[PDB]
Paper text:
The Tof1–Csm3 fork protection complex has a central role in the replisome—it promotes the progression of DNA replication forks and protects them when they stall, while also enabling cohesion establishment and checkpoint responses.
Here, I present the crystal structure of the Tof1–Csm3 complex from Chaetomium thermophilum at 3.1 Å resolution. The only construct of the complex resulting in diffracting crystals was Tof1(1–728)ΔL1,2,3–Csm3(48–157). Here, three predicted disordered loops were deleted from Tof1: L1 (256–363), L2 (420–434), L3 (558–585). Csm3 further extends the alpha-helical repeat structure by forming a five-helix bundle which packs on the C-terminus of Tof1. However, in contrast to this domain, the helical bundle of Csm3 is flattened such that it no longer has a hydrophobic core and thus does not appear to be an independently folded structure and rather acts as a cap on the C-terminus of Tof1. The interface between the two is largely hydrophobic with some salt bridges, and consists of a large percentage of Csm3, showing why both proteins are required to stabilize each other. α25 and α26 from Arm-8 plus the following helix α27 contain all the interaction sites for Csm3. As previously noted, there is a highly conserved cleft within this interior towards the N-terminus of Tof1, lined with basic and hydrophobic residues. In our structure, the purification tag of a symmetry copy occupies this cleft.
Author numbering:
A (entry chain A): -13 to -2, 3 to 195, 204 to 428, 441 to 574
B (entry chain B): 69 to 152
Amino acid sequence: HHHSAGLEVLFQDGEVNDVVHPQVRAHINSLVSALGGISIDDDGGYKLGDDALEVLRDLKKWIRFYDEKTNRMDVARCLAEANIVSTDLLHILALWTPNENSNKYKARIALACFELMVPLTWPIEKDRETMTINHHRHIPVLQLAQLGYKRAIINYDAAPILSTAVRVALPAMAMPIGERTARDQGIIKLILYFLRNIAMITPPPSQISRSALIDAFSYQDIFLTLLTIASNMGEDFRTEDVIVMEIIFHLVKRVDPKGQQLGSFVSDFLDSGFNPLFSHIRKSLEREAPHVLHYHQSQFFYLVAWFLEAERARRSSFNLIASVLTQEMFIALNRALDRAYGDKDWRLLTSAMRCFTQILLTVQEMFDSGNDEDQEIADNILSRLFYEESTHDAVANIVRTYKDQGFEYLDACTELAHTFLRILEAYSKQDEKMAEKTSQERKFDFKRFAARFTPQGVVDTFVTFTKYYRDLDDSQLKRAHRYFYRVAFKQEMSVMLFRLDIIHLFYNMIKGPEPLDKNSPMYKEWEELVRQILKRCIRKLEERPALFTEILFSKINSTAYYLE
Amino acid sequence: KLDDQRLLSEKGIPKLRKMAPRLKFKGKGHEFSDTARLLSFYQEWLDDLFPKATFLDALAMVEKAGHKTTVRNARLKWIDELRP
């Protein structure tokens, strides 16, 4: 080729049609221009529109009566392409300075901005009956537009938008709960939902967006605002308990509870707003409140589990988390465990199991705690847990029955099974004839309890967990190590472990395609473990020749005892 | 099942009672080399039973077949040979 190809030119504007209603795009653009614009004069700033208040109210009408009522997403897409939530609305909120909060007109236009920003930054759920061919077309663009909104709100150089949001609700937040009208309670809800919306926004499946969110929250005193609402959850507040919980849930999302950026907030939250907030949410779920939703239940269990781990990183006082260690919580999560399994809800069960694991880890640290009252309460909780067979038979059945439930569920159940055995083992140990009768009787009860983890179902679930050894961390490998170590050190002779598929995995784990890295601290413990299991494997084939044919593992606990 | 009939046919199982002590490939000192000879012995048997099948996928098909009522009655025959 010597000359240029004519097809190199691309495709091109009013003459070409769009996916939205052509008249909607014109109407929405008539409003986005009329609300204002940047001053042509140098250092002039932002010229607010003459009828800016009414056009903002008209844009809110276009969302409620055209998009919502008719099940369309045209005005949503129009505002996304106009990018007002990033180019116009941010400049309008910048005009309402802290000294200018007395301006009634400037405060009303500021509210109208959030009355528009909340539905636009609202999270979208693809799987809905109401969704049409229209919604599914626009959603990919809107989801990306929502990321562009969050980026502009967090990184706005001129004015603090999140701090400005707090100021809108602040006067209606000062007045008592009884004195608050339906309008005044709506402003608190709108502003609290705005903070949740921006914290919710993440790309559909970067870490800088997670870091900048925490940095903007502390600087613009939102963590201080969240603490004041949570600490006064009894008087002056109600219903908002789940909305505040959701904000903190989307903040602790993929965040470590020990040595974090939000280290300043975690200590202040446990000291003031832990018990009043989490006791209210517990009571809200029990009474089956109208404001509470099904997804709020699993989020509650996640936050309890997250803050319990965050508490042990400081452990200033084990009394600051007293509300979640009450017997009322125990009855509630036990009923939640039975209900989630029956309804086949695994996401709720995963959060409940992880919550329960953190509660058991807390009572163990309270047993060795310096506080006299802490050891008294830890022992009375453990006394009930050691004999409550209703909880025992339920936890044992979960690990026994596992089929295509996901790795998050697998990591949660194996966490609970390992800890429940470990914590009760400590209780199993700690005039002479009278004291021994009650102390040595617990050793009989523990061997009965540990026999629930011996069947094939529990074994296979731990085996499938061990398969992910290439991705598992040091603590994750300890669970699998201590379970198999507990099989041989149960006097069970690891008859259950003898299966071709199980023996295959253990071998290539140390010496095969994936060497598990020889430099790892867990490798040396595993190498010693696998060798000990294989030592008994070769010996049992010589002892009984039936093991060659019965390597199928399809056997039960009665046929396994015959082999040992 | 027609695919699980290879176990029902009694061609693979009578070789597991005849070929296993026949090799005598056991060393108490080594764990890895002894289990590698064991894995190579079963991999050979699985290839002769049904070729063009993954090793890990083959083992899982054997245990599922073992749970069957017809197979369970046949497996209980092998354990009786041990009793005096």
